[PDB]
Amino acid sequence: TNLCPFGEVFNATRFASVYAWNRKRISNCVADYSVLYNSASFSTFKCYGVSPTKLNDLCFTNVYADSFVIRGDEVRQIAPGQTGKIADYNYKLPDDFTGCVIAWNSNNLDSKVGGNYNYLYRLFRKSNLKPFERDISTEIYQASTPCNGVNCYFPLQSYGFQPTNGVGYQPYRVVVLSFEAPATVCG
């Protein structure tokens, strides 16, 4: 009856870049999910194959918590069947996803005067990512002549997070909960 460590996932001081999105495995814990969807602090809360008010009366084996940062105009891409730089090259959800996508504006934490450049995203790739795949390649992108490690671009690009940005360019924190032997997480 040890509670689930949702504080260490949602209230982490620092979040990862979307190209290197974090995964925390949640097991052997009792969860009270109300506290999340009734906290009113969230801008997006999309669930698939499960209801937010009807997910507390069910048990799962394990819960995977993938977390990252994107820009406002990219929050739309964190959904099954979406395309774009984030969905094609950074973080791709499968079509049969049965989890939830929670997002909230983080201008007060991840932007600063002079720009926060710690958050990166992948701009180019040779092919679309597979579902839940992580790409940490640092190879020069080949747009005919080989690049020899030096039409040859850095694969990752840093976000220009300034507090004065418009809402579509403001930072948004994203948590993707995936639900999946005896069942160890329950409500």
Binding site: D73, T83, D96, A103
Partner: protein
């Protein structure tokens, strides 16, 4: 943003509604469907994604609606299963872009009206209504909607009140008022003209004191 024309169907029937989005790339926009009931309420039918897209319904409708798309024809369909009780309403196809966005362009094209179980096409029974005097024309017991009601072939248009029909005992009732001066009538003829396309009926009733 075109949609199928309104249909009048009888209970026990399946009907399918089409919505062809034009002016943009239909392939990468969520398509929502919405029902408007006459209780000043707009319920959410659901949402479908074209180009490899799962569908997510409202639980009130997860058993009543089926959503499909066709990228090639660039259209989206929604099929209503069974007869939707006496609950006939208007249906819309919306255009969602994704989270932190809204439904931008809308189609009103399709209206859904479900006929009564025991139905017979019936021509109107029209009666004049005699007492700036107000005159009337009562159009009772017709099916189905609608029934055009004009005065003197569209001559009299000011001061005319053609009231909406009402469904009573599976038939429709309408009434019209015309305010014509006490010197014009009975001096000049007043003829309420009623047209019923369903029975191909055209009738003209003169009001006499």
């Amino acid at each position: 943003l075109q949609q199928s024309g309104p249909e009048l169907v009888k209970p026990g029937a399946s009907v399918k509604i089409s919505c062809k989005a034009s002016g943009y790339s239909f392939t990468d926009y969520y398509m929502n469907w919405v029902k408007q009931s006459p209780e000043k309420s707009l319920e959410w039918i659901g949402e479908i994604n074209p180009n490899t897209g799962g569908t997510t319904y409202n639980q009130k409708f997860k058993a009543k609606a089926t959503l499909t798309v066709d990228k090639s024809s660039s259209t989206a369909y929604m099929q209503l299963k069974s007869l939707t009780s006496e609950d006939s309403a208007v249906y819309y196809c919306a255009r969602y872009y994704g989270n932190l966005y809204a439904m931008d362009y809308w189609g009103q094209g399709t209206s859904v009206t479900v006929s009564s179980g025991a139905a017979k096409t019936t021509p109107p029974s029209v009666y004049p209504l005699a007492p700036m005097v107000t005159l009337g024309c009562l159009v009772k017991g017709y099916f189905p909607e609608p029934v055009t009601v004009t005065w003197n072939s569209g001559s009299l248009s000011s001061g005319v009140h053609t009231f909406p029909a009402v469904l009573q005992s599976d038939l429709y009732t309408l009434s019209s008022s015309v305010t014509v001066p006490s010197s014009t009538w009975p001096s000049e003829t007043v003829t309420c003209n009623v047209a019923h396309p369903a029975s191909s009926t055209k009738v003209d009733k003169k009001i006499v004191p």
